[PDB]
Amino acid sequence: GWTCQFCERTFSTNRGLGVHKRRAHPVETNTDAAPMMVKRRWHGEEIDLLARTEARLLAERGQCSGGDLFGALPGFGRTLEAIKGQRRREPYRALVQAHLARFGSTSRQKRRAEYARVQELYKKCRSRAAAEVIDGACGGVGHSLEEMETYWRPILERVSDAPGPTPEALHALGRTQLWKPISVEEIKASRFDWRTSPGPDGIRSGQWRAVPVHLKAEMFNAWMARGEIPEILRQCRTVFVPKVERPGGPGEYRPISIASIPLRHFHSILARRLLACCPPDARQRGFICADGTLENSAVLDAVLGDSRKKLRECHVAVLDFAKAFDTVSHEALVELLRLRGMPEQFCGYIAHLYDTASTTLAVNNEMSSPVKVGRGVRQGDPLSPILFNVVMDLILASLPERVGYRLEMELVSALAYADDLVLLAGSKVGMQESISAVDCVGRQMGLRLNCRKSAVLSMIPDGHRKKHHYLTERTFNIGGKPLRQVSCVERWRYLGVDFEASGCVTLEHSISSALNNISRAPLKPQQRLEILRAHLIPRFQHGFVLGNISDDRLRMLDVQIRKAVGQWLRLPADVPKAYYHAAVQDGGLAIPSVRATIPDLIVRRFGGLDSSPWSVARAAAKSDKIRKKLRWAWKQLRRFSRVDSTTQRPSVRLFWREHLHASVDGRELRESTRTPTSTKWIRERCAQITGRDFVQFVHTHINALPSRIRGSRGRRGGGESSLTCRAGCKVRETTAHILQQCHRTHGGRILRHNKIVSFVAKAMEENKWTVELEPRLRTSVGLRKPDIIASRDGVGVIVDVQVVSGQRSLDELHREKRNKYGNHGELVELVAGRLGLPKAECVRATSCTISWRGVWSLTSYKELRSIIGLREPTLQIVPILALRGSHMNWTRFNQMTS
DNA sequence: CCTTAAGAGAGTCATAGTTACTCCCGCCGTTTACCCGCGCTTCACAG
DNA sequence: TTAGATGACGAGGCATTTGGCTAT
RNA sequence: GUAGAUCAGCUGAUCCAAUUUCGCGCGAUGAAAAUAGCC
DNA sequence: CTGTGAAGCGCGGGTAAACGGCGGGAGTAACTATGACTCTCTTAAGGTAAAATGCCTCGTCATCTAA
Ligand SMILES: Cc1cn([C@H]2C[C@H](O)[C@@H](COP(=O)(O)OP(=O)(O)OP(=O)(O)O)O2)c(=O)[nH]c1=O
Ligand SMILES: [Mg+2]
Ligand SMILES: [Zn+2]
Ligand SMILES: [Zn+2]
């Protein structure tokens, strides 16, 4: 009977019809959920403004009544009868005297050229090449010097005519070590980014880095004595960098200005001193030593959660400043720093630095005539964020005192992160005076609010029906210009986190398009693995941790990533799941599993939120959403981790190590953990290996060669022809039989042995040993034949080479090969007599034991690194030789089928 | 020279868990549209 | 007062690494 | 016909292959700074 | 023409008769969480090796004890 007015579905009850109308038809139900406004309760934010206006009029005029207060409050939204009936109350008549007391004081050649570009760029700058592969292109400057200059030159040349701070905002803001000389240990402690381009002056980073520290100290102290630097070091070049991934004009670029490396080093030391000297307002979570993005997103999510759950009025604006650094006036900044109580030498230094600012614009290696700069704060100077924080402190100070949203008895008034601002309010009135305060003190400094991006979210609930409701009509102004309303279904991005009206939602991501782009770039197969490992997956980590995501979507994302890796390395689908995700030291390929990694990072970031210095974040930690999220994160972390033996923390690495070493194909890789030199071929030395050979090593490493036993997984209902050896050995045809046991593969085993013997012998000859290869020694047990014997300084060593299977202990195999020579006794005397030395104690047995998958025996590695002086870059090549010998064995076994 | 190794993950479908609301009924507290005047203003009225 | 033994600190030589990502 | 190989119908497409182009073995392919945070 | 008295108007104390915030109470649409199942399933050769920072090792110097 009950039928929906918007989709005509039929329901059993009015209850289910209402629950349907809430979820399936949001805007229509938000229209029906609108409260009436006949007898609205007086929020205290309205009460404070009415009381303070009445108090200032009792000071200013002496005597007044409600008929004047209706005139003094135009946009207040109360009738004169309401004003009278509020005015007759006793807490208001207390607050009026309380305020009065204070106030009365071709196609083919193009791809060959693209290969030539990509392979050079991958070696010059790997991160740039990876960003080029993922996005599609780079080098985003798409305008001429004229089109850049005719827009940007009247902006830079104009002096900002802002009148500077007013004494009201200075009084609101008001609620010695600096310019001492710089020491040597201060220069040593203050780390610097030496991977940097030089300025127009042309002194490179290594040229300044070679200068000794005490001479740099006396040049810095000399420049502090003058109050200026040499003028050739003070000049700047500007390169325009795009703000949007497809810029539509010169206004969508930013003027990043680069000066000399000594200026940036000196200003970085002064920047760390200035950051230690004057901390900003506690609501400014930007350019300080705290994880402010976590804090701002957590507080905003908690406020938006409690707003819906407890049915309270909640008015939220998101604000931005247009061209924030590029518009600050020299006058307002320098006199604010003077009235902040900074030393006069520092203020004179900043005034003389920005007085003499001249810049050359450079667009695609075409340079402009020099530009005189009238608006301050260079994008690219170390002192510039710390100076912009001083500007933001005035704006944060000028907010009204008790306007905000009270979450867990903390009155959250504002959240700041550089120029980004979120304002919170209880009523329309409190937000409107907050916007007027922010706008006014912004215009005092030369800043203008970004009207393209400023927007307001506004919730007014219904009592007596218990309905949440969001406004749709535009109700707030900057200077008369109406602000935009965020609708109930609108989705917006805050600090790289996706938000809606109910809080955090799932981050919008482009995994499949990026995996398509990597799959088509002209790359070697290991380069695709490195771009996936180091560059693609850490992009979406931030929004997955700070946002909200389910286990299902993470699980499908891991399925997509594993399918991409299985396409690139030509792996079958029954490769163990832990091999993609276990570490390189453990024998895995170290592609991060998003399902396992993201709860671990949510625990490790959000668990520290209780220990924050900021009280608002500690209030947010008590909120219901973050508590529920942290319980889910702890449950999923306990599902996909093992407790580490030493530090007792949960770890994802031991979970993947246990699952890899427990699996059938990964079982032989269990000793790779003890010897990190065995797997340097996977990631460190992969560029020294051809792309065919790398994929053949990957197939050799986790047994993925199509032998008749692994090929017949699930299909072993057939006869012995589906299981036994192709060469007729009448045994079960494993891959290890083909590589290690088959009569067809005997000469390849001999060649692999002789190659490893020759390489070890050449390395021992470089390490000054007197190597004799293959002694035919006739001891009384029979003809015995060690691989190599050698002498150095009277000490003798016998070395023998093994390439073995991993279903036994490798160290046991080393000892079993060792004791054949070391416990022979008489043969040691034959070795000593051949080397010309009498003492049998000075002759030591040693073995060179490595698996056919390229895993070193640990004790044999210690013998070859300690008894013999072989360096470990020699020892990193023996796994490559064993792996390539194994795949040559596999290739010859498949060729000889005839 | 070498001394057999040996299923596993993605997709389907049914049921359970839970989240985010619904509508119904009663009660006190709050709000303000009016009732009821007192002090000043304006035309009748005294001089 | 001088000589020998022990402990601490500094210098020299050799070997290993030389990141990535997000916000503004 | 392709740097080389291969599949199609002299051209396209795909590779485990793939340093083009400009210049005299060898140089250049010309990006990009700052402050925090996280791994 | 000029200042005061009856009627008019604004400016304030008071009431009451609705709103509206909320407790208690019974419900459910429509999303993810678990589990038991089912489905699906590999091959192109050949003989192979510059610079900066941090850690490790060795030497030199200083202090304490004994003669
Ligand atoms: C993104 C970014 C910002 N900044 C600084 C410069 C900006 O003035 C300040 C705030 O950044 P933005 O607000 O992102 O940049 P903007 O204000 O100049 O651009 P818009 O007008 O579109 O808002 O942070 C950098 O120095 N480097 C950067 O990469
Ligand atoms: Mg901005
Ligand atoms: Zn409907
Ligand atoms: Zn065989």
TrEMBL record:
Zn(2+) 2 binds at C725, C729, H737, C742. GO terms for molecular function: RNA-directed DNA polymerase activity; zinc ion binding. InterPro entries: DNA/RNA_pol_sf, RT_dom, Znf_C2H2_type. Zn(2+) 1 binds at C4, C7, H20, H25. DTTP binds at R254, K323, A324, F325. Residues 2-30 form the C2H2-type domain. Pfam families: RVT_1 (PF00078). Mg(2+) binds at D320, F321, D419. The keyword Transferase applies. SUPFAM superfamilies: DNA/RNA polymerases (SSF56672). Residues 222-499 form the Reverse transcriptase domain. It comes from Bombyx mori (Silk moth). This is Reverse transcriptase-like protein. Keywords: Metal-binding, Nucleotide-binding, Nucleotidyltransferase, RNA-directed DNA polymerase, Transferase, Zinc, Zinc-finger.
